[PDB]
Amino acid sequence: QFAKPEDAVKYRQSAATLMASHFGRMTPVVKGQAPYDAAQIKANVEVLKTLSALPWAAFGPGTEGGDARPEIWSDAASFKQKQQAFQDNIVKLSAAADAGDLDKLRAAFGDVGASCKACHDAYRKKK
Template identity: 45%
Template sequence: MRSLLAAAALALLAGSALAQPTFATPQDAIKYRQATLKEMQQNFKRVADMAGGRAEFDAKTAEASAARAAELIKLPWAAFGPGTEGGKASPAIWKEQDKFKAAAAKAEAEVGKLAVAAKTGSLDAIKAAIGPAGASCKACHDAFRE
């Protein structure tokens, strides 16, 4: 029984390690974070366009796009490690790590709330959540993007 528990714990740890991206070069990290953030933005924009009346509302598309944005926004932060400066990232990211992490967490939370709102299928719920989600993204960009 002990060996079974040890094997399960080891498998869990190995799976966790595999979930964290690794980068051969700083440029790989920059490309990764830019790609994930761009894809997140495209999904977010699809929902924002529906909420703003710039696109026809489709509840299933809104739900799928918001869910995808909520998953994608969790990914880029590991690519802002030491030595990965560059791209459009402000040096403030590396100088003010606590503020950056707080801004990233706020954006994750607000985009997560958007996904929950979109899951209801209610355009009004999406409209209520899109503003705070967009504001959290903008606040991070204003502080940490060049």
């Protein structure tokens, strides 16, 4: 869907921006600094689930740019493993949210964050 590689870069960066907001806005809730409303979090995690499927199709070969490290394309299987494992972690977060289980939510939230970081550490250029 991208006329030029720059369009893929802009897309995946915007998807990431939205993921960071929908993930990060739950930090106060999982810390107990903001109240836990199960329906609110269920709905937010459903947005995050949709968003968290979106970046990967925007790393389609030849879309080097931005802060993607080159290793994404040359090790396609390993990058796919990491995005699939991340989306798996999002499924666990969805299950916790859908159950209204705050303890499971906290644990799942931590695992998701670790998965974001693990991918960035391997595949995102430093600043």
